[PDB]
Amino acid sequence: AWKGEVLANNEAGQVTSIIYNPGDVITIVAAGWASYGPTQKWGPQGDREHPDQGLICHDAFCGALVMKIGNSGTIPVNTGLFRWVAPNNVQGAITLIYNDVPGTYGNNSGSFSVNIGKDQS
Amino acid sequence: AWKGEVLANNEAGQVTSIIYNPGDVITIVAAGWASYGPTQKWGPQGDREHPDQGLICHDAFCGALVMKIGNSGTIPVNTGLFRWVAPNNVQGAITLIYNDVPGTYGNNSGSFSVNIGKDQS
């Protein structure tokens, strides 16, 4: 299992110790509060009122938690995933990232606390 | 495992199939959007700007997911719990509930989708 913090202001994303292999079943739980700029804060699902303009992951809101697995594209995590199996041919190390627009992470604040474990399979 | 929806207007809470027994290790993942009355919606950690004026759970925000286990008081769930063990003396059936003030559930809207499983021990 891996536990750690994902800073909203970390454009590169936080690499985890988890290597996703074919067939693997994993669980992720994400909590806390962060911002893409405003004094207001949002949870891991982000700000459902913010537009999608140039976000790294078009499938989640601004300020959501997303991930990449190896060199996949971005995949939504949000609050987390229960006993989840990736699509065919997705494999590698799990990096977690705050969903925002490239070049705009400087004004971000806060962090999410995230756990990831491999489940029985 | 149990998977189901928790309606925000359900004052009694959603009973699950899960019986928490001494020594159990559990994982919960909650997702979605709901409202304790306003047109806006919030995720499982609720509205961090809303005052607590009589919530069923004073350790979580208005609109957050909470639970009771058997005869326990409310216990925060929020986005979820990763490989969690219950407080001393806590055991029994898990009921999931939207955190709002007694008697004001009629104007709530939405639902959270929740998964619960028992982990290896």
Added chain:
Amino acid sequence: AWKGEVLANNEAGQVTSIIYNPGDVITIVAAGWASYGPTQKWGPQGDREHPDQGLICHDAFCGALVMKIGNSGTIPVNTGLFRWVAPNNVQGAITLIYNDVPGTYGNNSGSFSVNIGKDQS
């Protein structure tokens, strides 16, 4: 989880740390060599050539590993059980016992090494 030795001369059996509750899924692995009398020894499936003339568990061989769950009657374990769920209405502490005839444990020798864990459910 629980790891321990079960002596073949132990008539009362070895009580583990595991309490079996409804819905639980367990795995058992048993290894080693023991005897009900002879200078020879057998593994956890026992002696497939020996008669049953009053074994505590009529569904396994003399010299096999068996168990009780709470006040159940005996259940075969043998080499082990993989992600097993018990019959209805069985609950309580797991007691591991060597399968022999009541009153004859005194000439027994050796032990099995046993791992028990609860699995994800």
Added chain:
Amino acid sequence: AWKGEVLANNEAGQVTSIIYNPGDVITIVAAGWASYGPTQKWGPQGDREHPDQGLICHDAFCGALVMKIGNSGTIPVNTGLFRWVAPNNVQGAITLIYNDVPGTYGNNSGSFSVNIGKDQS
């Protein structure tokens, strides 16, 4: 998870669907009765009285269950392995094999039933 039978007379061993990847934790439970020649039978620990006269695995008895992970050397399985982790550099498909002397498989009989799964990590 994977379940299947491993014949005593199969010199090549039985390929499973389990790919052991670095950091995997696995459980294996084996049961049953087989023979490397004699009319009598033995369990997955094999025959503790028979000499090693060129077994494919010199760390288990003749008639024991062993395995390869990819093109590893032989690894003892016996009755099973509880929440086990492989040696460094060991990875690939798990192949289960009856431990006998090469070219003597033709007088073998019986089989073992084996479950393998990956465990929480």
